[PDB]
CSV table of C-alpha atoms in Angstrom, one decimal:
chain,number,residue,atom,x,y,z
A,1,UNK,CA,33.7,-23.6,2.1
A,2,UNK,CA,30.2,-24.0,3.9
A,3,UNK,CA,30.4,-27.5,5.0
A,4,UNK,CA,33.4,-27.2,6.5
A,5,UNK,CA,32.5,-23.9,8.2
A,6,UNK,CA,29.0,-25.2,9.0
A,7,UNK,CA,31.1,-28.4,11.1
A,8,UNK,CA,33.8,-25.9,12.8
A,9,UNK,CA,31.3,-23.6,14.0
A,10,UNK,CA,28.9,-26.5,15.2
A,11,UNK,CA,32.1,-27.7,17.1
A,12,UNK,CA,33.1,-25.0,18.9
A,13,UNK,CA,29.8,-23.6,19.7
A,14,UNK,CA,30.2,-19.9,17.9
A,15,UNK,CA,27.0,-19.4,16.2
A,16,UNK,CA,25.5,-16.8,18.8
A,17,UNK,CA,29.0,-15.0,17.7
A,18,UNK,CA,28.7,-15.6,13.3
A,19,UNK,CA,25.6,-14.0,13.7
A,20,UNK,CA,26.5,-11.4,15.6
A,21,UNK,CA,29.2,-10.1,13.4
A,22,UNK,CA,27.0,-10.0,10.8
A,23,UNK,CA,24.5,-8.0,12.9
A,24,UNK,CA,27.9,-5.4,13.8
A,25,UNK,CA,28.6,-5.2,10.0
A,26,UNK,CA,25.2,-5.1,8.6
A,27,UNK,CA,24.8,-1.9,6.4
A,28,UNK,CA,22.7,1.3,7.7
A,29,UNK,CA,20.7,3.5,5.9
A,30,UNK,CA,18.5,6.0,6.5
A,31,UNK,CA,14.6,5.4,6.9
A,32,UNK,CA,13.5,8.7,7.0
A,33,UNK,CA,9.9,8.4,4.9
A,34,UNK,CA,9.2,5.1,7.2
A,35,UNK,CA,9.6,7.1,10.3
A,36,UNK,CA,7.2,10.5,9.1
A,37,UNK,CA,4.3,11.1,11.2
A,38,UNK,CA,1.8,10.3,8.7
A,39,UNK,CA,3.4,6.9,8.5
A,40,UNK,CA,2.9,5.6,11.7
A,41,UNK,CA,0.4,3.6,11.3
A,42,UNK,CA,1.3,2.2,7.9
A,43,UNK,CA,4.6,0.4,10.0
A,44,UNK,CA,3.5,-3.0,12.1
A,45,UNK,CA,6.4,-2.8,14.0
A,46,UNK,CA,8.4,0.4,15.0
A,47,UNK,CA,12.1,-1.6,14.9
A,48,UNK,CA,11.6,-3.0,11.7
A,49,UNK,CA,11.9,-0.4,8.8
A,50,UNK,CA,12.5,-0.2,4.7
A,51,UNK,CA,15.4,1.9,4.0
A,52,UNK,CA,14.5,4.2,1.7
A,53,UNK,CA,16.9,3.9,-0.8
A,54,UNK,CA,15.2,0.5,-1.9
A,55,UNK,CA,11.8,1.2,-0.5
A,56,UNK,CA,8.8,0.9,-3.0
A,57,UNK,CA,7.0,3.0,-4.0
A,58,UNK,CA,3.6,2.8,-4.4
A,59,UNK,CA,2.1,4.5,-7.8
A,60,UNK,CA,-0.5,6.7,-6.0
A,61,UNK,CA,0.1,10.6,-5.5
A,62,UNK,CA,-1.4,10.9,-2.0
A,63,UNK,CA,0.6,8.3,-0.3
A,64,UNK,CA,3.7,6.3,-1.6
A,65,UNK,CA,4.8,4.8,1.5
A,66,UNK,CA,4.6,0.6,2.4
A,67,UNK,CA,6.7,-1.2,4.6
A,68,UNK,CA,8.4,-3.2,1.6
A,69,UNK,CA,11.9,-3.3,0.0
A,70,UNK,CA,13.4,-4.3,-2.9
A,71,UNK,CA,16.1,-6.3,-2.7
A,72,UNK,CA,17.9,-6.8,-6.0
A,73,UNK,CA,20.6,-9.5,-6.0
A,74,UNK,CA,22.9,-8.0,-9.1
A,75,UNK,CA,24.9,-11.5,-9.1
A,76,UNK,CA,22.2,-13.8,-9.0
A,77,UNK,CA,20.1,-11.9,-10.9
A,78,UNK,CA,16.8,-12.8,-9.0
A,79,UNK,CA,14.8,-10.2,-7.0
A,80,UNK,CA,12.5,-10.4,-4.0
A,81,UNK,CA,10.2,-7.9,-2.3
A,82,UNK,CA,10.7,-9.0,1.3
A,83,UNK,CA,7.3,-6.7,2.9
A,84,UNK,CA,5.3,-6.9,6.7
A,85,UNK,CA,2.6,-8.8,7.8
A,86,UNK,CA,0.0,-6.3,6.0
A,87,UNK,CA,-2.2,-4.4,8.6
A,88,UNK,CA,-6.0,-4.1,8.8
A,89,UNK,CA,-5.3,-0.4,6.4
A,90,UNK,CA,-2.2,-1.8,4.5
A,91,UNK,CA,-4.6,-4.9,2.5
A,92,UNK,CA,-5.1,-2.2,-0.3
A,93,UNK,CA,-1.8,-1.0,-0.4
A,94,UNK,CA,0.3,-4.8,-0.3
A,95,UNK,CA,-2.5,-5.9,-3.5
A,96,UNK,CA,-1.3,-2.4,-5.0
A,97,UNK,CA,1.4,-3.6,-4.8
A,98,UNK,CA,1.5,-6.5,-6.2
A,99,UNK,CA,-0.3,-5.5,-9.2
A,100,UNK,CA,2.4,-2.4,-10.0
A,101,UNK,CA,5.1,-4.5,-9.2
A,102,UNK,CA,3.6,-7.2,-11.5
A,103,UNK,CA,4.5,-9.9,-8.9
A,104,UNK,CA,3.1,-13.8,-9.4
A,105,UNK,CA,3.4,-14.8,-6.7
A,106,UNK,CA,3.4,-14.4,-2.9
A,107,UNK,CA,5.2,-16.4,-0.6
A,108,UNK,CA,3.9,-16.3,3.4
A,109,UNK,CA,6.0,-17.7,5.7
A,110,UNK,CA,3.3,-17.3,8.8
A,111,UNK,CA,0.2,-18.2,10.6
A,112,UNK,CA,-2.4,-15.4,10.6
A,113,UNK,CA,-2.6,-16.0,14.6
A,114,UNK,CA,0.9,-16.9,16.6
A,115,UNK,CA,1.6,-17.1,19.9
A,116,UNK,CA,-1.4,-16.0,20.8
A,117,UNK,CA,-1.2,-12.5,18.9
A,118,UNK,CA,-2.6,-11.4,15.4
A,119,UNK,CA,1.1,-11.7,13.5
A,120,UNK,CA,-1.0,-10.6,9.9
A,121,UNK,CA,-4.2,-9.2,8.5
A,122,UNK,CA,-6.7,-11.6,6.9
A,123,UNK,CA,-5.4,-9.8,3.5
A,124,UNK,CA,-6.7,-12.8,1.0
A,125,UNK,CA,-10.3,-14.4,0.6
A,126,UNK,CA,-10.8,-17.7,2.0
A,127,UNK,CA,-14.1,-18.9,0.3
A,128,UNK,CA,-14.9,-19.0,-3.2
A,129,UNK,CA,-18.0,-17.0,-3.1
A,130,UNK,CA,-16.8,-14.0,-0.4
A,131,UNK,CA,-14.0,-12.2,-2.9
A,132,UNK,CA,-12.7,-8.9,-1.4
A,133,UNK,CA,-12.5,-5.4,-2.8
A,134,UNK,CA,-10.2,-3.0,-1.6
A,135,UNK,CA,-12.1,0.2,-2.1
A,136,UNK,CA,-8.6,2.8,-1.6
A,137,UNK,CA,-6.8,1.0,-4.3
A,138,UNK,CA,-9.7,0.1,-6.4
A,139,UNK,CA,-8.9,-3.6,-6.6
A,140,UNK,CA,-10.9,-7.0,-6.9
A,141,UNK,CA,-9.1,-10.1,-5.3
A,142,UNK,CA,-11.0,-13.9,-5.7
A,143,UNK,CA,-10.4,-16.9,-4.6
A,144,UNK,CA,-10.0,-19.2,-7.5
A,145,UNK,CA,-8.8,-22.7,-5.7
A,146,UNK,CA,-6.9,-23.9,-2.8
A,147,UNK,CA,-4.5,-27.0,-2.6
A,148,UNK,CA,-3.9,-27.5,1.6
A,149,UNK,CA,-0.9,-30.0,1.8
A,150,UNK,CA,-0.1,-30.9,5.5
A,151,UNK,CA,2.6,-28.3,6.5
A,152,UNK,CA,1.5,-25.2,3.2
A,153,UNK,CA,-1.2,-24.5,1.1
A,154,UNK,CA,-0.6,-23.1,-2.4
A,155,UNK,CA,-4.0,-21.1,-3.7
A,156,UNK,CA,-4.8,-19.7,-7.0
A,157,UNK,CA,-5.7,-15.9,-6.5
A,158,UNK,CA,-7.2,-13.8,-9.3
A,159,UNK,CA,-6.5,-10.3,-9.2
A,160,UNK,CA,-8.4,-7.1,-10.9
A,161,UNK,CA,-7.8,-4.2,-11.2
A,162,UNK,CA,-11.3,-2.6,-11.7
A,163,UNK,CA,-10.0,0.6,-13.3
A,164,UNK,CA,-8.9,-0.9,-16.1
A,165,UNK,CA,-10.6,-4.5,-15.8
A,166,UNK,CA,-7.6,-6.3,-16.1
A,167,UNK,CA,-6.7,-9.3,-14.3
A,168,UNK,CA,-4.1,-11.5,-13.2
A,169,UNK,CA,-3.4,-14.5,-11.8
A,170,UNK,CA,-1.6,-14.8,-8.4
A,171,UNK,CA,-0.6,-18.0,-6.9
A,172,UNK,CA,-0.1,-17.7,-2.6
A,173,UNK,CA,2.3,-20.2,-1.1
A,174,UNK,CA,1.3,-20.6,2.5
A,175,UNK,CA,3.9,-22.1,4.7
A,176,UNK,CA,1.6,-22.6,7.7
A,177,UNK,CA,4.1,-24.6,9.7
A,178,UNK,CA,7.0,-21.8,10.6
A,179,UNK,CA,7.1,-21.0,14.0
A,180,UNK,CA,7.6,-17.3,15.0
A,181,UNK,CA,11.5,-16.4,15.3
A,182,UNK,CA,12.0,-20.3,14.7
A,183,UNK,CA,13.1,-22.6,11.6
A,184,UNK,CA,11.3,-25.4,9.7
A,185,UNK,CA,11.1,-28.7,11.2
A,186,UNK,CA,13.6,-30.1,8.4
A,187,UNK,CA,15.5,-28.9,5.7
A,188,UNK,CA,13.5,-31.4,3.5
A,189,UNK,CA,10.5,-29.3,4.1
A,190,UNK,CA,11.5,-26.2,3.8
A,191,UNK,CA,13.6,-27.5,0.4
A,192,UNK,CA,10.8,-29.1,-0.6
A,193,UNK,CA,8.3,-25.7,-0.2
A,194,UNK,CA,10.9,-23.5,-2.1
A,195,UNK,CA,10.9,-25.4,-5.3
A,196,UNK,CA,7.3,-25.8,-6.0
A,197,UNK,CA,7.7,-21.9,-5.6
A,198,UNK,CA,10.3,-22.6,-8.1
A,199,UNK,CA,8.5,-24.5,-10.2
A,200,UNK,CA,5.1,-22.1,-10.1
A,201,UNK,CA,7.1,-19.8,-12.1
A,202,UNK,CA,7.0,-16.8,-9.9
A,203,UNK,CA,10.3,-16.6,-9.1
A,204,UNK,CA,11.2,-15.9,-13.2
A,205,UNK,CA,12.0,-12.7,-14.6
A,206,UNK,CA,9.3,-12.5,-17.1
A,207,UNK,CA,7.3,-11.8,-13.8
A,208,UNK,CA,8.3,-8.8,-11.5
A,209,UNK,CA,9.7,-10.1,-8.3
A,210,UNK,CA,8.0,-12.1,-5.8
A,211,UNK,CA,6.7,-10.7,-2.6
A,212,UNK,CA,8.0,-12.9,0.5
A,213,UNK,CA,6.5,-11.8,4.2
A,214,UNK,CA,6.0,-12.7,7.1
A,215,UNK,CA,5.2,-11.4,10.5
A,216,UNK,CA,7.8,-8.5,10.0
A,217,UNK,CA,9.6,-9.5,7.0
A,218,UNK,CA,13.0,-9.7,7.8
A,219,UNK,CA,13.4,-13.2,9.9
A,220,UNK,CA,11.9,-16.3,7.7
A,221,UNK,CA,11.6,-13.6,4.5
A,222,UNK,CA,15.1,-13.3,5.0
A,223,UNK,CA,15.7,-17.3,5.8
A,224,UNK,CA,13.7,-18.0,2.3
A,225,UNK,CA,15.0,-15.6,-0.1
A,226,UNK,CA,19.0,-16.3,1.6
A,227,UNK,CA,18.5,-19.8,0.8
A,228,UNK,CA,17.1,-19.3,-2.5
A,229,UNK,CA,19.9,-16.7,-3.7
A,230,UNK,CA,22.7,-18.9,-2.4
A,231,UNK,CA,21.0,-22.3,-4.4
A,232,UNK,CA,20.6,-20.0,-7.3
A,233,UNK,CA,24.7,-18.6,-7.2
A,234,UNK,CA,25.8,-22.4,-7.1
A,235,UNK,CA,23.3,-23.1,-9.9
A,236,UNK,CA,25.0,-20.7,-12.1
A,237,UNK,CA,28.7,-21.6,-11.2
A,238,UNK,CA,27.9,-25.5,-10.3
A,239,UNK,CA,30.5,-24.2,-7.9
A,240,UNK,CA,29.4,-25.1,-4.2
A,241,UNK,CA,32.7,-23.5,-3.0
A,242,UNK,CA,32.4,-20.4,-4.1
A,243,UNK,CA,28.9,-19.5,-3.0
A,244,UNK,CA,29.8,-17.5,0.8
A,245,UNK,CA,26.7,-17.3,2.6
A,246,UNK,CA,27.5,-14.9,4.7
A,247,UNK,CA,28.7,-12.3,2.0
A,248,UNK,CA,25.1,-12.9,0.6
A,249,UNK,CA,23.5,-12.3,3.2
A,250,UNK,CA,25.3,-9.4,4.2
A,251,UNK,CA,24.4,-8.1,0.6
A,252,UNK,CA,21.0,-8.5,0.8
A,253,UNK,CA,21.0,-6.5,4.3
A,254,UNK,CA,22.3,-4.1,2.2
A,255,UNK,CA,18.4,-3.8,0.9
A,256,UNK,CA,16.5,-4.4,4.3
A,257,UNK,CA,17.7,-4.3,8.0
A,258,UNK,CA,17.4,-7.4,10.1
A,259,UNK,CA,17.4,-9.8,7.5
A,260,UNK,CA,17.6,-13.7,9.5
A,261,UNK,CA,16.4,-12.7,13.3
A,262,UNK,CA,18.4,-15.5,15.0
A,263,UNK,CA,21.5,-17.3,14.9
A,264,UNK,CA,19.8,-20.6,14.2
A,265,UNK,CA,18.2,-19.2,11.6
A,266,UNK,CA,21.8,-18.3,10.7
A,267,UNK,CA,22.6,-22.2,11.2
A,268,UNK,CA,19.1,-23.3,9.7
A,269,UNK,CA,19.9,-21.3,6.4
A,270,UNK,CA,23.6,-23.1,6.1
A,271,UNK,CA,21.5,-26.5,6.6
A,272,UNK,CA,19.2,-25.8,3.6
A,273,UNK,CA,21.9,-24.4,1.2
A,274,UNK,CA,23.9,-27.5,1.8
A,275,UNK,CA,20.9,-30.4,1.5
A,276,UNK,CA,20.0,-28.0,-1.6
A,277,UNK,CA,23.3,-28.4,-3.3
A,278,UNK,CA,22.9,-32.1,-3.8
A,279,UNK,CA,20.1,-31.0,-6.2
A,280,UNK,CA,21.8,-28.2,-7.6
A,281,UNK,CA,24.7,-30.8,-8.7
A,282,UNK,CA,23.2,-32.9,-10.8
A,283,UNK,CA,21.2,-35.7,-7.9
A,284,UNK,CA,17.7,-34.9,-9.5
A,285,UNK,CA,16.5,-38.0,-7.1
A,286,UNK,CA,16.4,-36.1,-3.9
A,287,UNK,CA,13.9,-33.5,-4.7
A,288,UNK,CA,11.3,-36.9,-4.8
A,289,UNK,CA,13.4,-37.7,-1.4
A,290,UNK,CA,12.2,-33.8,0.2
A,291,UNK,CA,8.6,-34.7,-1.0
A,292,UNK,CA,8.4,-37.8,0.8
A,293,UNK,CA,10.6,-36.6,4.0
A,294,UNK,CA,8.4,-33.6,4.2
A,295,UNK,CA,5.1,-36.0,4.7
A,296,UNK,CA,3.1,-33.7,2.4
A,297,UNK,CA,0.3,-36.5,1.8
């Protein structure tokens, strides 16, 4: 059970080691239309690769390939599509994306600039009355509003595909507070940020699945979407015991490599799935607790 592990691995120190077993026994799967030539510059980073048994697929006949997986969690029955940082040349292709995939939402877990370095293209509009148009894919993309809260900003995107002139809209959940390879500042936060993505709807499965990125895709996607699965196993058992977070996670590397980038990430996603379960089993109060903790204003 997770509490208890979370406590014995805190006392003797052995996180570095949890998380590198699950490194050792992480699946492995070929990549072979990621790595192609013509590809090259469609990848942000050459480590960091879809397998291509879960790739997607984009629906154009010239080029196919993004740097996006699916990761379908049979159990849970949730997916996510965990996807880079686009590039400057990949805006087209993640809002092509989006719209074949049918996605509501998408969830971004970094800064545009970090550490110094461009982490992500400027993919989305950010005034009113400059929209974009990405002339490869043929698609319009507006901003419709903007709520900035003190640590993420949720905007209301409309979408267009001017082929057919239909629209859609797409709601983007900006965590802006995430440091590169780090974890939130509390679990509160971090709790707090997943359920209004909860509660926009675009995790449902009326939508298709939400796409989740950051600078890579694999290190806060993979914190977010862990967390989420986990809260979402629990939910369906109200079985905190039976929910093994390693097992999920090693389920979802199954669909992506490098899925959490650091054992306190490890540590941070145990901390969220257990502050999470207090919801999950029937404490509806702390959720109002996460808001205030989390000093949105």
């Amino acid at each position: 059970e997770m509490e208890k592990e979370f406590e014995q691995i805190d006392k003797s120190g052995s996180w570095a080691a949890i998380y590198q077993d699950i490194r050792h026994e992480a699946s492995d799967f070929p990549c072979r239309v990621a790595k192609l030539p013509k590809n090259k510059n469609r990848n942000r980073y050459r480590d960091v690769s879809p397998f291509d048994h879960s790739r997607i697929k984009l629906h154009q006949e010239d080029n196919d390939y993004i740097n996006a997986s699916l990761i379908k969690m049979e159990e849970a029955q949730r997916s996510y599509i965990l996807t880079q940082g686009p590039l400057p040349n990949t805006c087209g292709h993640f809002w092509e994306m989006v719209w074949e995939q049918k996605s509501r939402g998408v969830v971004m877990l970094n800064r545009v600039m970090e550490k110094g370095s461009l982490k992500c293209a400027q993919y989305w509009p950010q005034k009113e009355e400059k929209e974009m148009i990405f002339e490869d894919t043929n698609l319009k993309l507006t901003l419709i509003s903007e709520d900035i809260k003190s640590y993420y900003t949720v905007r209301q995107l409309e979408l267009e595909n001017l082929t057919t002139q239909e629209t859609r809209e797409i709601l983007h959940f900006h965590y802006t507070t995430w440091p590169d390879f780090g974890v939130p500042e509390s679990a509160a936060s971090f709790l707090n940020f997943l359920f209004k993505v909860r509660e926009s709807g675009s995790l449902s499965p009326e939508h298709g699945p939400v796409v989740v990125h950051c600078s890579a895709g694999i290190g806060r996607s993979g914190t977010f979407c862990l967390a989420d699965t986990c809260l979402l196993l629990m939910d369906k058992r109200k079985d905190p015991s039976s929910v093994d977070i390693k097992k999920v996670l090693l389920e979802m590397r199954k669909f992506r490599m490098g899925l959490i980038q650091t054992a306190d990430q490890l540590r941070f996603s145990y901390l969220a799935v257990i502050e999470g379960a207090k919801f999950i089993m029937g404490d509806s109060s702390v959720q109002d607790q996460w808001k205030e903790l989390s000093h949105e204003d």
